[PDB]
């Protein structure tokens, strides 16, 4: 007997984006006591959001999902699955996805957590699109969520002003025309230490009164890697999608650093009038949540329009990257 | 307007191989605590604990090496790796890129997938989806677990349950369909049933308080798994277009033998159907459990390559993932 195969939608796209940004604004001056100029010129950040003590990666993911569902004209009963992508869910288990599903009033739906630094969103988008086309699901939530503030060593003058909190979710479903291109992804596992938790939780657990773990970043190494490698990645994603650089309306790189992204814009040879995501300005670097948060900001302000041709490039920890061409959601 | 390319990959995908790593240190029921007490309740006789210098990532690498060797492939033939685990003790970097680098394939795509014990089913399905979509042609999927450091040796409810190990599968194009449609789901309202009890940040901010351990509400998990997974198994067979009487091999997650005995009966397979019992000397290795159980069956010869197998993963998050597959190697 032959094992049967399911089939799903051919054309898949981003139906909606929904964003949750924590209430507390932390300015450059507040976090660093000419600090405002210093931080802004190096990173592009003016302010960022910090989540409250009672908030978590999962709780922000839930709020983002509620908003994404609303923008898609859907309820939780329309969703067949949810992928949470995060690096700041602070339990080995349970995973965030089932908790999020439950809070949404759809406790039974499939889901898992996906971790790949701030390439997680691209990987999760690709996985959702592949699952829907394979018939494993019809409509899915993909939410990038991050609570980075508790992981920051406020004495680490190399990164303390970089990381921030927030969540944003997209609805992926069948569309009239193809809305999501092939995923272009890869790694550099040899540079795994470039962005890291410096002390693993178990070594820490054997001596909790000694130094605790914090996020560490080898800035120059990441700058060099991102600025010199992601251009070729962007071109691969566009080639796979069958589009030219000059057909790109919107560029949404991961909001790691403005200077990096300015160099990527140049390398990718986009139109003079191409819209470039700059959400980092009042959001900072929110890792897995960055791209969908950046997408929401562009749509919220009317800088981008739904249906606009967008190039997304996620780069960051593990040294991991994931990129794809999409049409902008509602 | 501008077209976004519509693409496809190979429709027929299957398991080309399985490879297993288990650590050297055998910990008997007698040592850990007695033998009859644990055995009666779990079906566990012994389990393997990893050495201090081992990790989920290191065991996953070694399981991947063996998997590649058994498929007659090298690292250069692989387009990416999915690592599924619950015991990679870093928020970042993820295990997959490190595993890829250790295999001499630092550049390949990959990521970590967490869904408790059902991680392997989700990861398997995702790799199959990605290959059929044309995003990759050949993949490694590896379940890995170093659970021993997470055990509270004073917790008389679970200290004898969890163990260490890793197993990987090579997934790629096969002449006939080798991986059935994914059947998966959750119960997020019972998320507290299997859990880390104190989150890492709360612990870090309060080092004078207690440290985190794995906790298990046994009865709640038992009742959910024993009585709900039968229907899951039926759906996966239905999706694969196969009948219960056609299943050659049954591989439930090796959570508890007594749960699995009840599952066997509920599923109404042939009397001569082969049931995975790797828990006896491997214990419960969470995400690594199913591929380890597949490797054990092939190693003893109880299962043969090509045999029709039903895999059911169930556990934390309250999460489940199941599919019918043809046995590898
Ligand atoms: C994205 O820019 O990559 C950064 C990944 C953020 C995860 C940081 C992990 C913090 C753990 C330290 C306790
Ligand atoms: C299968 O039974 O799913 C169980 C998931 C493994 C539990 C590990 C999390 C405990 C960490 C405690 C520090």
Residues whose CB is less than 8 angstroms from the CB of residue B277 and which lie 6 or more positions away in sequence, other chains included: B43, B254, B257, B260
Q: Are A313 and A321 in contact (CB under 8 A)?
A: yes
Q: Beta strands B138-145 and B165-173: pairing type? A: antiparallel
Residues whose CB is less than 8 angstroms from the CB of residue B57 and which lie 6 or more positions away in sequence, other chains included: B83, B88, B95, B98, B99, B102, B144
Q: Are A51 and A94 in contact (CB under 8 A)?
A: no
> CA A201, A206, A208, A209 torsion: positive or negative?
negative
- What is the C-alpha separation between B255 and B274, in angstroms, rounded? 17
Q: Beta strands A195-197 and A215-217: pairing type? A: antiparallel
Backbone angles phi, psi at A100, to 5 degrees: -60, -50
- What is the C-alpha separation between A176 and A179, in angstroms, rounded? 9
Q: Are B183 and B323 in contact (CB under 8 A)?
A: yes
Backbone angles phi, psi at A99, to 5 degrees: -60, -45
- What is the C-alpha separation between B4 and A240, in angstroms, rounded? 9
104-123 of A, contacting B, C-beta below 8 A: 107-117, 119-120, 123
- What is the C-alpha separation between A95 and A108, in angstroms, rounded? 14
**What residues of B are in contact with residue A113 (Cβ under 8 Å)?**
113-115
- Among B86, B117, B158, B260, the active-site one is B117
Nearest one of A125, A148, A147, A130 to A61, comparing CA atoms: A147
Q: Which CATH class is domain B1-177?
A: alpha beta
In sequence order, the β-bridge partners of residue A12 are A174
Annotated catalytic residue A89: no
User: How many whole angstroms from its chain centre is CA B295?
Assistant: 12
Contact between chains at B93 and A117 (C-beta distance less than 8 A): yes
Contact between chains at A205 and B149 (C-beta distance less than 8 A): yes
- What is the C-alpha separation between A300 and B269, in angstroms, rounded? 56
Q: Do domains B1-177 and B178-327 have the same CATH topology?
A: yes
Q: What is the C-alpha end-to-end distance of chain B, expressed in Å? A: 48
List chain A gaps (C–N > 2.5 A) by preceding residue. 33
Q: Check if B180 contacts A (Cβ < 8 Å).
A: yes
- State the Rg of chain B over Cα: 19
Which ligand is nearest to the Cα of residue B218, counting in written order?
2
The two tokens of residue A240 are 């796979």
- What is the C-alpha separation between A111 and B115, in angstroms, rounded? 8
- Among B70, B88, B253, B256, the active-site one is B253
Contact between chains at B97 and A126 (C-beta distance less than 8 A): no
What ranges make up the beta strands (E) of chain B?
Answer: 13-21, 25-28, 46-49, 80-84, 109-114, 138-145, 165-173, 183-186, 194-196, 214-216, 249-252, 274-275, 308-315, 319-326
Give the H or E element holding residue B224.
Answer: helix B218-239
Q: Are A84 and A98 in contact (CB under 8 A)?
A: no
**What residues of A are in contact with residue B119 (Cβ under 8 Å)?**
112
Ligand 1 pocket, A86 CB below 6 A?
Answer: no
- What is the C-alpha separation between A183 and A330, in angstroms, rounded? 21
Name the residue ranges covered by the structural domains of chain B: 1-177, 178-327
Q: Are A304 and A262 in contact (CB under 8 A)?
A: no
List chain B gaps (C–N > 2.5 A) by preceding residue. 33
- Residue A269 CB: number of other CB atoms within 10 A? 14
- What is the C-alpha separation between B4 and A274, in angstroms, rounded? 18
User: How many whole angstroms from its chain centre is CA B224?
Assistant: 18
Residue B24's Cβ-count burial label (10 Å; 0-12, 13-18, 19+) is exposed
b/e for B97-129, b at 16 or more Cβ within 10 A?
bbbbbbbebbebbbbbbbbbbbbbbbbbbbbbb
Give the number of residues written for chain A.
330
Backbone angles phi, psi at A268, to 5 degrees: -80, -5
Contact between chains at B110 and A116 (C-beta distance less than 8 A): yes
Q: Are B54 and B79 in contact (CB under 8 A)?
A: no
Residues whose CB is less than 8 angstroms from the CB of residue B142 and which lie 6 or more positions away in sequence, other chains included: B60, B63, B64, B67, B81, B82, B83, B84, B99, B166, B167, B168, B169, B291
Q: Are B15 and B180 in contact (CB under 8 A)?
A: no
Which ligand is nearest to the Cα of residue B317, counting in written order?
2
Annotated catalytic residue A118: yes
Of B2, B130, B191, the CB nearest to A130: B130
To 10 degrees, what angle do helices B289-300 and B119-133 make? 90
- What is the C-alpha separation between B127 and B107, in angstroms, rounded? 17
Annotated catalytic residue B117: yes
Architecture of the CATH domain A1-178: 3-Layer(aba) Sandwich (3.40)
b/e for B197-208, b at 16 or more Cβ within 10 A?
ebbbbebbeeee
User: How many whole angstroms from its chain centre is CA A41?
Assistant: 23
b/e for B233-271, b at 16 or more Cβ within 10 A?
bbebbbbbbbebebbbbbbbbbbbbebbebbbebbebee
Q: Are A132 and A173 in contact (CB under 8 A)?
A: yes
Q: How many CB pairs under 8 A join A and B?
A: 304
Q: In chain B, whose CA is at the least distance from the CA of A178?
A: B4
Q: In chain A, whose CA is at the least distance from the CA of B88?
A: A92
Nearest one of B148, B189, B119 to B47, comparing CA atoms: B148
Q: Are B248 and B273 in contact (CB under 8 A)?
A: yes
The two tokens of residue A99 are 């908790």
- List the CATH code of the domain at A179-328: 3.40.47.10
Q: Which CATH class is domain B178-327?
A: alpha beta
With H, G, I as helix, E, B as strand and everything else as coil, classify residue A17: strand
- What is the C-alpha separation between A144 and A109, in angstroms, rounded? 18
- Among A28, A87, A118, A261, the active-site one is A118
Q: For residue B254, what is the DSSP state?
A: S
To 10 degrees, what angle do helices B257-267 and B218-239 make? 40
User: How many whole angstroms from its chain centre is CA B278?
Assistant: 12
What ranges make up the beta strands (E) of B127-263?
Answer: 138-145, 165-173, 183-186, 194-196, 214-216, 249-252
Cα(B157) to ligand 2 centroid in Å equals: 14
* Strand order from edge to edge, sheet including A275-276: A184-187, A320-327, A309-316, A250-253, A275-276
Residues whose CB is less than 8 angstroms from the CB of residue B46 and which lie 6 or more positions away in sequence, other chains included: B26, B27, B28, B29, B280, B281, B283
With H, G, I as helix, E, B as strand and everything else as coil, classify residue B84: strand
- What is the C-alpha separation between B87 and B272, in angstroms, rounded? 36
209-238 of B, contacting A, C-beta below 8 A: 211-212, 214
- What is the C-alpha separation between A313 and A290, in angstroms, rounded? 11
Q: For residue A79, what is the DSSP state?
A: -
Atom of ligand 1 nearest to the CA of B204: 13
- What is the C-alpha separation between A265 and A49, in angstroms, rounded? 26
Q: Are A29 and A67 in contact (CB under 8 A)?
A: no
Residues whose CB is less than 8 angstroms from the CB of residue B130 and which lie 6 or more positions away in sequence, other chains included: A126, A127, A130, A183, B80, B136, B139
Which ligand is nearest to the Cα of residue B321, counting in written order?
2
* Closest approach of A72 to chain B, Cα-based (Å): 21
Q: Are B133 and A129 in contact (CB under 8 A)?
A: yes
Give the H or E element holding residue B204.
Answer: helix B200-205
Contact between chains at B94 and A112 (C-beta distance less than 8 A): no
Could you give the maximum distance between any two Cα atoms of chain B, in Å?
72
With H, G, I as helix, E, B as strand and everything else as coil, classify residue B124: helix
Contact between chains at B111 and A110 (C-beta distance less than 8 A): no
- What is the C-alpha separation between B135 and B121, in angstroms, rounded? 19
b/e for A165-182, b at 16 or more Cβ within 10 A?
bbbbbbbbbbbeebbbbb
* Closest approach of B129 to chain A, Cα-based (Å): 5
- What is the C-alpha separation between B141 and B128, in angstroms, rounded? 10
Q: For residue B179, what is the DSSP state?
A: B
Q: Are B191 and B317 in contact (CB under 8 A)?
A: yes
Helices (H), chain A: 28-31, 35-43, 57-72, 96-103, 120-133, 201-206, 219-241, 258-267, 280-283, 290-300
Rounded to the nearest 10°, the torsion over CA B237, B242, B243, B244 is: -50
């Amino acid at each position: 007997t032959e094992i049967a195969t399911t089939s799903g939608a051919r054309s898949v796209g981003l139906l909606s984006v929904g964003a949750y940004r924590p209430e507390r604004v932390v300015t450059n001056d507040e976090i660093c006591q000419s600090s405002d100029e210093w931080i802004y010129t190096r990173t592009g950040i003016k302010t960022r959001r910090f989540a409250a003590d009672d908030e978590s990666a999962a709780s922000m993911a839930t709020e983002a999902c509620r908003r994404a569902l609303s923008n898609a004209g859907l309820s939780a009963a329309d969703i067949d699955g949810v992928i949470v992508t995060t690096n700041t869910h602070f339990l080995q288990t349970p995973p965030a996805a089932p908790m999020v599903a439950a809070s949404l009033g759809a406790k039974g739906i499939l889901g898992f957590d996906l971790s790949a630094g701030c390439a997680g969103f691209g990987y999760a988008l690709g996985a959702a699109a592949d699952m829907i086309r394979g018939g494993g699901a019809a409509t899915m939530l993909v939410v990038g969520t991050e609570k980075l503030s508790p992981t920051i060593d406020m004495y680490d003058r190399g990164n303390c002003f970089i990381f921030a909190d927030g969540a944003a979710a997209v609805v992926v479903g069948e569309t009239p025309f193809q809305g999501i291109g092939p995923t272009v992804a890869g790694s550099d596992g040899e540079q795994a230490d470039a962005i890291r938790q410096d002390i693993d939780w178990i070594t820490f657990a054997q001596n909790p009164s000694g130094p605790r773990p914090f996020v560490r970043l080898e800035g120059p190494a990441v700058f060099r890697w991102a600025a010199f490698k992601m251009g070729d990645v962007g071109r691969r994603a566009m080639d796979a999608a069958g589009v030219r650089p000059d057909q790109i309306d919107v560029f949404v790189p991961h909001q790691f650093n403005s200077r990096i992204n300015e160099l990527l814009v140049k390398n990718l040879q986009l139109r003079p009038d191409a819209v470039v995501a700059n959400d980092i300005e009042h959001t900072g670097n929110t890792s897995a949540a960055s791209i969908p948060l950046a997408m929401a900001e562009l749509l919220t302000t009317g800088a981008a329009k739904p249906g606009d041709l967008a190039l997304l490039i996620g780069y960051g920890a593990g040294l991991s990257y994931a990129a794809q061409v999409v049409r902008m959601p509602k």
